[PDB]
Each structure stands twice: as structure tokens, then as C-alpha cells.
Amino acid sequence: TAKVDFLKKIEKEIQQKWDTERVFEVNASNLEKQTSKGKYFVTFPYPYMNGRLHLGHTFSLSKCEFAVGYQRLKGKCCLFPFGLHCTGMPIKACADKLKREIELYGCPPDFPYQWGIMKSLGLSDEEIVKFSEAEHWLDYFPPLAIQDLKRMGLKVDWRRSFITTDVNPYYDSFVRWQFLTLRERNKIKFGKRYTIYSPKDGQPCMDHDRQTGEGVGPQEYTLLKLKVLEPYPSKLSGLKGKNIFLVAATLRPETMFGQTNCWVRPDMKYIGFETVNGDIFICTQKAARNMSYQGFTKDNGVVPVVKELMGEEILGASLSAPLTSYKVIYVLPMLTIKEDKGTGVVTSVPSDSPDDIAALRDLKKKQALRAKYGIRDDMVLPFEPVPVIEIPGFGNLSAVTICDELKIQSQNDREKLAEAKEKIYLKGFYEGIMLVDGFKGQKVQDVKKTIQKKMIDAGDALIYMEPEKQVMSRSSDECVVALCDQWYLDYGEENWKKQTSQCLKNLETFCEETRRNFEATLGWLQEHACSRTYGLGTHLPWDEQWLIESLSDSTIYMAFYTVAHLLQGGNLHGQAESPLGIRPQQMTKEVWDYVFFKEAPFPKTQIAKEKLDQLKQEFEFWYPVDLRVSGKDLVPNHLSYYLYNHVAMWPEQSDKWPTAVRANGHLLLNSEKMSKSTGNFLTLTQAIDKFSADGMRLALADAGDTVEDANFVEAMADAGILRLYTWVEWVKEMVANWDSLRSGPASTFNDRVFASELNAGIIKTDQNYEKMMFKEALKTGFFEFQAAKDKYRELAVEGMHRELVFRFIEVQTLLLAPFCPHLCEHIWTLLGKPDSIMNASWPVAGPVNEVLIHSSQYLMEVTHDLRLRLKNYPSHCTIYVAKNYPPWQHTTLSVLRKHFEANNGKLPDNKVIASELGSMPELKKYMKKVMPFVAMIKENLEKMGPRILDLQLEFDEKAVLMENIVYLTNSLELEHIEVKFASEAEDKIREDCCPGKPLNVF
Ligand SMILES: CC(C)C[C@H](N)C(=O)NS(=O)(=O)OC[C@H]1O[C@@H](n2cnc3c(N)ncnc32)[C@H](O)[C@@H]1O
């Protein structure tokens, strides 16, 4: 426990030092004068302030944090700014839900929650009251976010942080300029469109104010109206004189020429309600709610219910249906009717629907159902399926034939009916051919929309939009599809979409899966409602009654990063003075144009030219955004709008469009989903408290660098804490015994091996950092680096060479620094370095001798085999080393070499190999030993490349063993080791010993 506390002490000290030194505050005015090696602008999408940042946020931002930590060592000047997103309604929603209990009860509220979660967050009793207003949320959470992030140690120029609502005047002016420019270029449009809608919230329910189905949109349905004929059913007797329609949803209108009846569920609760023209529709309550928000009722959302009833009360009723050949069709019962899809009212097309003929034959079989539900023989018997569409592999009555084939006799055979439904599922969309007059011999795909229009024009059908999948909102309201008027961004325009597609071609997506996501969400995308009325944020500058949603004021704010340090300077709300002395409202549309558009004219403004020139310098220098890292959830919405709006704001400058986007997975904790409800949860401040800034950052580097779910494992973080502590102890020990280390020329075999391994580690780790495989960089640059140092220490019999030890410490500290900058800064100062490690440069790697490394691996294997053989049957040991392969081994290896040379390095099958080696008469006495030899060669070939096909080792085997005979004798606890050239060996050993695999007898 004391080790984590030691790490925390080091981190706090070093953080204060960094803060005072103002190391991570970059200014384009100064950095544009010294052309170093280019700028590096990274962004992490600013997180919502409806709470405290948790370990997933930290994992996602660690990507660009490690990126800048690496790129600064390579000479780039970096900009890693960090804003905070307060736009949206959850803050206001939970603040008003709080004021609800504050007013309707007391402090604390008497029950029979929002007050409960606030007290869970550990707040005092008399301080949750202040959270009734949203302004207090905005004053409370963003400071704690900044505090936690600084306590982590991010390389952020905090002078550029900001807030996103209209509480910030500067960011509000920025959003105003953006949306004025968008409306000036016909990007915003007012219109009445279909959209997923929250009745409780009274505004469209986009993706970030949702709770189920984060990408679901509306789905269209043809709503048939079947006129109820007199004599009306009993329960509708009070509705005589009015027109009553059973409304049924379908997706195949072209089939309505073959209606035999209408199915209702006898046990479902149906509602007959008055529509806008005074007619009466019989559907269900959810269907009627959707219709009420799609203009079907006189008032929006108001459903005037005039008759509740059950399906059994509707049974037997006579109907008039469109297109069908039967003048009167009846309402019949169907047991298997979902209450989630449509209106609860289905039509009977028994020729091309298996369920329909199933239920019809069930009613036709026995008297049981017809009597249990009151269906006389007039309502079932004279009704036969009508040939309407022919599928070539089935016939006119496709469903009839495939249900006679699958031998179905009940409407409850879920398995057989599902199979039959899938068997003709899409063979009717295309291969179906119409048969009715006016369409005889027409491709069904070429006529279905015309038939739907025919019914709509005749007033016999309407358009019913329904959520394709159930969508719950933050306010726990079930969403509908509303045809409502709003301001929308026209992401559907072909020119805009093609230009953003070209922008996606140039964009760097670190894998093809992310690009596929982008292309799919680019094709599918269309009109996007951006206007809200309830929530926080910035109002449309011309329609002050509409607020801009969170996913629409967040598309180009990266440009505001470049100027925020001079506009508002650190003050999150922008309420303090301006360092350049620019008034908040002094920023006009033309002023912003001049700041961000290169060929924009300097407009009439009381601002001096130097201030605007400095802002324009900052923007032109830092842009474009080199990298934006995010969880993959933001690809289908925020990042696509990001590309769109960048194309829209700078349509002439592709050099200002985003460069790279990197998506990662969502963070698991201990291999489980990170949810407070399961107790498997860690906030950033808690994670720091538990593992220090450096141990959690280490375990986060190891969490995952693919798009698959990342995994933060706490045990690995504890092990890394232990290893970091012992590493600091070892560096201290080495600095203490500076003079106890061997000096002079670094010449020994071990010195050379270790120097080569160190340079190889540098090269591997640099490559891993370029690829942003941070887990792989941690593997090669820490665990394997430490393995090389531990081996060098274990084998250095004459003590480790001082200069090599301190080169290793320096380089290891440089390689670990982007992951654990506090520990590495502490060790940097412990080495007596003048400057901070944040001024160091990437370590130069010397030469890498592959032969040295291969000989060290050979020595490892030899020692391992010696210790394994020591397990059984001393004091003296004799090792025999083969200079060449014995005759039979040499012959078989030559054959393998021939076959490898023959076909670009593919060894044939062991079948053919054993055939050829049996054809060679010299191998008679050895055919049993031959194929295990081939197997060993193939294994080590796949393991360590083709170098094992060499007829002689690249290094002196005996000399390698001799450079460490002393270590071998000391480790094996023996008194002497005799290394001999295997020609002195007896018959058995001389014949079996081959190079690289020395034999030995104790
Ligand atoms: C620009 C604007 C439209 C963005 C909007 N304000 C917003 O999304 N705010 S946020 O707090 O929900 O996320 C911000 C970043 O953090 C990632 N992330 C979030 N949770 C996890 C998790 N459990 N595991 C891994 N990564 C996560 C997430 O993808 C995103 O890149």
C-alpha cells in the first residue's frame, strides 16, 4: 500500500513542477518562429458533464495522451487541448427532477430517485439543494473534471479549456458564427420531417439523449383502412352513423388484391379513436399515439378515444377492403399476433403469407374455434386464397404449397412457419410476378409503390411511420415517430455527401472496419434534426426559441481550441477578462470569418489588427486536426457530422479537413462490463486513488489497441505498481554504487549482446509507437526491455558495465515516459540531468547484430536444457558441440534445402519428404530418426525463420559456451564444465550431436 502512496507523492510533486514551469502551454507565435519538425494537433471529444469522468473516458483519452508523449520526443510540437461538453438535456433533466423533490417534499424528501444518487456521490445534505438549477452543475462538475485530469498528468494546455452552453459567451458566439455560415450556404433548412420523437420531452430524440437503440430511425408502413359495414358489431352500436375503419399495417401492399379476411387478436385491447376528419380508427394505443404525432388526429399527441374493446368483441364484423376481389371480408381471430409491431390488426393474404392460410385452415378444420369466437360458416368457408403473385419455384399460391409441403396444421408451429416464411421471404420481393388485371406480368419491385399510391389516392390507405425497434429516452419515455417541423442539417445532399466521401478517402482510419463503419453511416445518412426546445446550449441566432442539440454544436469546435487561450484564457465559463482584451460580443460573424477563413477580408471592428492577426496565426498554424481518438460509438454520429461540417465550413481547403480518426473499444473492467449497477465501476479519481496516475496509466497502456473491447485488469495494475517500485529501487541502487560498476571499454560478449538487444528494443518500440500499438510498445519497451536487462545482469559474471547500465536506464526512462511520465521525470532528475525529461529527445539506436541475439537465444536454450537434465542423474559436466551436421542429418537437411529453394520456401508434405528420403540408399539405418528430424526442422523453421536451414551456425558455438562456462558452472552448482568438439565424443554422442543442440553428460 505504501508503494502506491510513494507513487502518488512523486506524482503530486512532479505535477506541481510541471504546472509552475508551464511546460505544456504552447503558443503559435513562439513555435512558428522555430521550425522544428512539425505540429501535432490531437483531440479527444469533450465529455458530457452530467457526472464525474470514469475509467472509460480515461482509456479513450489515453490514446492521444500517449500519442503526444511519444511525438514530443520525436521533435514535434504538440497541442492536446481539452474542452468540456455541457450542451444537452440530461443535466437540466436531472436538475429539474431534483427540484421536483425539493419543492414537492423537503430536505431530505419523505418517500414514498435523483436525491439518492446525489447523496451517493457523497454530497452534503445542504449542498444538493444548490443542484436544483443547472448553473450549479456547470459550476461544479467541470472544475472537478479539470482537477482529475490534471491529477492524472495529461500534457494539456489548460489555457484553452472551455464550456459549451450559452453560459459561455465566446463559445456561444463561435456556435452562432458556425450556424450562420451554415444557413448562408444552404446547409441548415427549416421543414416538416419524420423523426424519432420524445413526447415527454417535446423534441426529436437523437442519439445522445437516448437509452435504447442508439441508431434506430423510423420505418414506413402502408396503413390500409377497412371500412366496417353495417350491421356494426354489438360493441360499436353507439357509433352508428359514423364511418369506422380497421387500420392495418403492412409492408407488401401489392398483395392486397388477395384479401380473404382480417385477423385480430381476440385477447388484445383495441382502441377506436376519432381522427382529424371525424372518422373512427380501430387500432391499438401505441399505434394511435404514433398516428397522433403523425398528424392523424385533430390535435398533436391528443388521442380522442371513443371506444375501448377487445378483439373478441370485433370478431365476425363485416369489412370492405381495398383492391381485393371479395366485396365483404370478415374479422377473424388469430392467436399469434405480436403487440409490438404495427396496429395489432393484420390482413389475410392466404396466398402468399403462411400465417394467414394457417389460421384460415385452423378455422376451417373444427367447430371449436368458430364456436369459441362466434364465427359462423359465412365468415370462413366461402373464402379461398386468391392467386395474385406467382413465384416461379412455387406457383400462384406460394404459401399454400410450401405449407402443404412442410405439413403444417396449426398457426402455432413457430418453427415450421418461420422456416416457410424464410423460404419465400425475399423470393417475392424480386422473382414475384403480378397476375391481377392492370398489372399482369409485371415485376413486383416495379409496381408495389404504384399500387400503394393507387390506394393512397383513393383514400383507401395512408402512410404510417413507426420506430423499427423500441427506443427509450433518457427521461424514460418511449419514443414515437413524429412528422414535426424543425431545423435540420441537410446531410442528404448529393454534393455534400460526395465531398465528404472524398474527405473520407483522404481520412486515415487505422483499420478497414472503421472505414466500413464510416461508409455505411455515410450512405445511410440523411436529414438530421438539430433543433431542441428543452435543454442547455446555444439557441439558433435567428430563431432564438430553438436550442441546438449536443450532436450539432460539436462538429468544428476544434478550431475554437486554437484561440480559446487568447479569447477567455483558462476561465471555463469565459466570465473573466480576455488576455487580448477582446470583448465577448465584439466577435462578429465577419470577425470569425477573418479568424478562420484565409481569404477573408479584415472587417470593420474596434479590435486592433494585432489581436485578430494573432488569433488567425494560432488557427492557421495548429489546423488541421492531426488525430481524433474516440470510442467506436461516436463513428455513426458525431465523427460523421465532424467530417460533414469540416467539408461545409472550409469547402475549398481540403488541407484543413481532418487527417486521422482512431476508434477504440469500450473499456471492460476485470473482463466484465463496467456498470455501477453491478458494483464493477471506477471513476478517474477513484482509479488514481487506487493505482496512482502512473500505475493506472500503465495498466491502461496494456488495456487494448484494437477496436475490440479493451480490458483494464486490476491485478495487472498491481503487478505493474510492484515492478515500477522495484525499478526505481534498482535505479537508486545503481546510482549509489556508481563506482562499484566495471568501467573501461565495453568489450565483453555480454556487453555486446546487451547493447544489441537494447538497440533492437529501441527500434521495435519506436515502430510500435508510430503504429499506436501502445500495448505492443509497452511489451517491447518495458517488459522485454526489463527482460534484457535482467538477463544481462544474470550473465555478467565480472559485474555489469557502468556505461551500459546507465545507457539502459536513460533509454528505458525515455521509452517508458509517455506511459509513466511522473516516475520517468523523477528518475530523470535522479540521474542528475539538467533539464526536464519533457525536453529530451527520442533515444538513438546503435547497431543491431542479429548474430549476437541469436547466439544469446542459443545460450538461453542451452542453459535451460542443462538445468532440465540436472533434475536426475553431480560435480563435473561434459558438453559436446557439433561443428557440422552428421552425415544422415546433413543429407536430409540438404534435401529440405533443395525443396525450400525450389518453390519460394514451401516445404512439401511429410508424405513426399519421407518418400524421397526412403528412396535414398544411404538412409537405410536411419529412416526411423529421419522424420522426427524433419519435424524438428519444420517446427524451428516456423518458429525462428529460415536460418535453421543453414548447414552451419552463423556464430562460433563453442566460443559462445566458453564465454559463459563460469556462469554455467556457478548456476548448475557444479565444479567443472568441459566443452569438447564432439569428435572426442563416443559413438552415440558423436553420431547424434548436431550443431545448435549440444549434448552433455554430468
Ligand atoms: C463531441 C461530442 C458529440 C461528444 C459527446 N460529448 C460525448 O460522447 N461525451 S462522453 O462522455 O459520453 O464520451 C466522450 C469520449 O469518451 C468515449 N467513451 C465514453 N464512455 C466510454 C467507455 N465506457 N469505454 C471506452 N470509451 C468511452 C466516447 O466514445 C467519446 O470518444
Numbering used by the authors: 7 to 118, 156 to 916, 933 to 1061
Original paper wording:
Leucyl-tRNA synthetase (LRS), a class I AaRS, is particularly large and complex. HcLRS functions as the intracellular leucine sensor to modulate the activity of the mTOR complex 1 (mTORC1) by directly binding with RagD GTPase, the mediator of the AAs-dependent mTORC1 pathway. After screening truncations with different lengths, we found that deletion of the last 106 residues (N1071-1176C), designated as hcLRS_d106, gives improved crystals that diffract up to 2.5 Å resolution.
LeuAMS, a stable analog of LeuAMP, was bound in the aminoacylation active site in our structure. Leucine, instead binds to a deep and narrow pocket formed by residues Tyr52, Tyr54, Leu594 and Ser597. Interestingly, residue His251 from the CP core is within 4 Å of the leucine, and the N atom from the imidazole ring of His251 is only 2.6 Å from the—OH group of Tyr54 suggesting a role of His251 in leucine binding. The residues involved in interaction with Nva2AA are mainly from the conserved ‘threonine-rich region’ (T-rich region) and the ‘GTG loop’ with one exception, Lys464, which is from a helix of I4ae insertion. Experimentally, the role of the tRNA-A76 3′-OH group in the mechanism of LRS deacylation was tested in E. coli LRS by replaced the terminal adenosine of tRNALeu with 3′-deoxyadenosine, the results showed that the 3′-OH group of A76 has a prominent role in deacylation reaction. Interestingly, a very well ordered water molecule which hydrogen-bonds to the 3′-OH group of tRNA-A76 is observed in our structure (W1 in Figure 3B and C).
